């Protein structure tokens, strides 16, 4: 009913199930609740400015996920920033978001002004300080859960925003396995990482993470992939083009893989077809959606029949609870098959950009009493409700 409670509950029912694995380093669902309980208790002690979000700075280690959960457990949203982003990223966001604190899962490469910092050693000490924690004031409802920055703009995603997204991924559109084993390659500063983080966590699965050092080195990456017992794949189409440079990337060397999930770029017919050849018995999905409406809002299963019917791959069909439509420069409905701007309304739409009211007023509006978003995207929709992506209004 609350995603934090769902995840905490897996600590009680499957304490010893592995939840995270980085190149052979593993942690359990029990240690995840214990770490995030310990962090939350500690933040409760600091009397931090309430609502004010916390920046979480780091790469792809377990502590990243543990830290997120302790922050939302404390009542506040987390802002994830990746180690391999330039230093001014952390300076800009700190200046725009005015966070209550920065938690340095990885060492900060630069200072963050007056924002208090918890060092990696201090964080280590907190996680090793077990508490018996009442999670009585966790993030819930319309309150900010994460703020992911795209200038860069801080997309505020509430708890209920994320559940609209998560519920869709757990539905029969995708048929994800129970307790999935999922790849975690997109850095957590990126929206797409959510597509593997929270559907796996809601389902009690396990995250098999790749640090950037591995993806920076095709030798290492090609060597690493067969060692991961993953069922669910999440990445950009371009990253899959890299992995397909390996003839060995196929169902015989990766027998556990059953679901491929792509977002963030156009999936070319050549990429989907090479992959259909490599993994003929898997299910492949194209998805699309702006960060401002929580990860994705359309999907289409690229079946054999899809590959033969479509040259360019469509972006698919809307979530049941999300209303999508195509309008012209005046905000008026555009006929089926005519190009216009894609408008998105429903429960996953962000309440707006943090500390940027001018962008929020231009992009976000209300549609029949639902929050609605101007994507910058041109596309089409036929009468069957199938969407296609056709460029940007910019
Ligand atoms: N599967 C996809 N096919 C085509 N364009 C996409 C897809 N996924 C994301 N994009 C584009 O990426 C840009 C930013 O939106 P998004 O990355 O979906 O948040 C927009 O141009 C999107 O339409």
Numbering used by the authors: 3 to 152, 158 to 401
Can you quote the paper on this entry?
TA d-alanylation is performed by the Dlt pathway, which starts in the cytoplasm and continues extracellularly after d-Ala transportation through the membrane. The first step in the d-alanylation mechanism of TA is the transfer of the phosphopantetheinyl moiety of coenzyme A (Ppant) to the DltC protein by the Phosphopantetheinyl transferase AcpS. The d-alanine-d-alanyl carrier protein ligase (DltA) catalyzes a two-step reaction: the activation of d-Ala using ATP to form a d-alanyl-AMP intermediate and then the transfer of d-Ala as a thiol ester to the Ppant group of DltC. Altogether, we conclude that DltC1 acts as an interaction hub for all the successive cytoplasmic steps of the TA d-alanylation pathway.
To investigate this mechanism, we produced and purified L. plantarum DltA and solved its crystal structure at 2.1 Å resolution. The asymmetric unit of the crystal contains two DltA molecules which are largely similar (rmsd of 0.5 Å on 392 residues). The last 100 aminoacids constituting the C-terminal minor domain are not visible in the electron density although present in the purified sample. The overall structure of the large N-terminal domain (residues 3–395) is composed of three subdomains (referred in previous studies as subdomains A, B and C39) two of which, A and B, sharing a similar topology with a β-sheet flanked on both sides by α -helices. As crystallization was achieved in the presence of d-Ala and ATP, one molecule of d-Ala-AMP could be observed in the electron density of one DltA molecule of the asymmetric unit. The d-Ala-AMP binding cleft of DltA is defined at the interface between loop 270–274, the β strands β13 (residues 290–295), β14 (residues 305–308) and β21 (residues 394–399) and the P-loop (phosphate binding loop or Walker A motif) comprised between residues 152 and 160. More precisely, the adenine ring is sandwiched between residues Gly271 and Glu272 on one side and Tyr295 on the other side. In our DltA structure, the P-loop is well defined in one molecule of the asymmetric unit. Although no direct interaction is established with the d-Ala-AMP, a locally positively charged environment mainly through the Lys160 is created in the vicinity of the phosphate group. These new structural data suggest that the P-loop could therefore contribute to the stabilization of the substrate binding.
